[PDB]
Design goal:
The structure is a homodimer of 99-residue chains. By secondary structure, chain A is mostly beta strands. Chain A has one helix and nine strands. Chain A has one domain: Cathepsin D, subunit A, domain 1 (Beta Barrel). Chain A starts with a strand and ends with a strand. Bound molecules: the ligand COc1ccc(S(=O)(=O)N(CC(C)C)C[C@@H](O)[C@H](Cc2ccccc2)NC(=O)O[C@H]2CO[C@H]3O[C@@H]4OCC[C@@H]4[C@H]32)cc1. The ligand COc1ccc(S(=O)(=O)N(CC(C)C)C[C@@H](O)[C@H](Cc2ccccc2)NC(=O)O[C@H]2CO[C@H]3O[C@@H]4OCC[C@@H]4[C@H]32)cc1 sits at the interface of chains A and B. Chains A, B: It comes from Human immunodeficiency virus type 1 group M subtype B (isolate BRU/LAI) (HIV-1). Chains A, B: This is Protease. Chains A, B: Homodimer, whose active site consists of two apposed aspartic acid residues.
Chain lengths: 99, 99
């Protein structure tokens, strides 16, 4: 699609089996969900943001489906106030910003 | 332009007479700059993101040039680690996300 920005650009995403919703966020380098069920051990990772830095759980080689694209990526689980799809995932589906 | 997302999508903008750089940020509701001096009246605002809240000054109906277009609208000013162009500003130049 071609998405205008009059509202927050939420998209449907299937992440490691579960249908979730998340914000396409071009100012985010990383993809981060709050409370998804992902199998197994995770590695600790730090992530920054406007307010300071958070400890998050890093899960690798997680399948992510957006708009019909199946991709495999790194998914963080952490106390973000909204699920975000970052540039790491958006590059894998060929997303561009256009003006 | 058509921008891929392999690197942070910075753009040149002119604001308060100064050339600045800022992220085209679809996850940002508003535009936020650090260390810029604007002339009008401001009102206090708090915004929140990853790692918590940020106190900012809200300046309304402010002129900003982005690429070559004169956009008049809200600009927040506060100690963010990176300047960001938010959706309110980007909608006025017809910016879209495509994939
Ligand atoms: C109401 O108006 C607002 C309100 C909030 C914000 S924001 O900056 O907090 N943010 C909201 C979003 C988290 C829901 C916009 C994001 O695009 C910020 C924009 C941002 C970028 C850098 C630093 C601070 C903020 N990016 C961000 O927090 O990214 C996180 C996750 O991935 C990492 O990539 C980034 O780069 C490395 C660290 C951050 C990490 C902006 C305008």
């Amino acid at each position: 699609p071609q998405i205008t920005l009059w509202k927050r650009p939420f998209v449907t995403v299937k992440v490691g089996g579960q249908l979730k919703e998340a914000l396409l966020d071009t100012g985010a380098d990383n993809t981060i969900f709050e409370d998804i069920n992902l199998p197994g051990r995770w590695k600790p990772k730090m992530v920054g943001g406007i307010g300071g830095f958070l400890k998050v759980r890093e899960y690798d080689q997680v399948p992510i489906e957006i708009a019909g694209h199946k991709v495999i990526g790194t998914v963080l689980v952490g106390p973000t106030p909204v699920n975000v799809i970052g540039r790491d995932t958006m590059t894998q589906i060929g997303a561009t910003l256009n003006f």
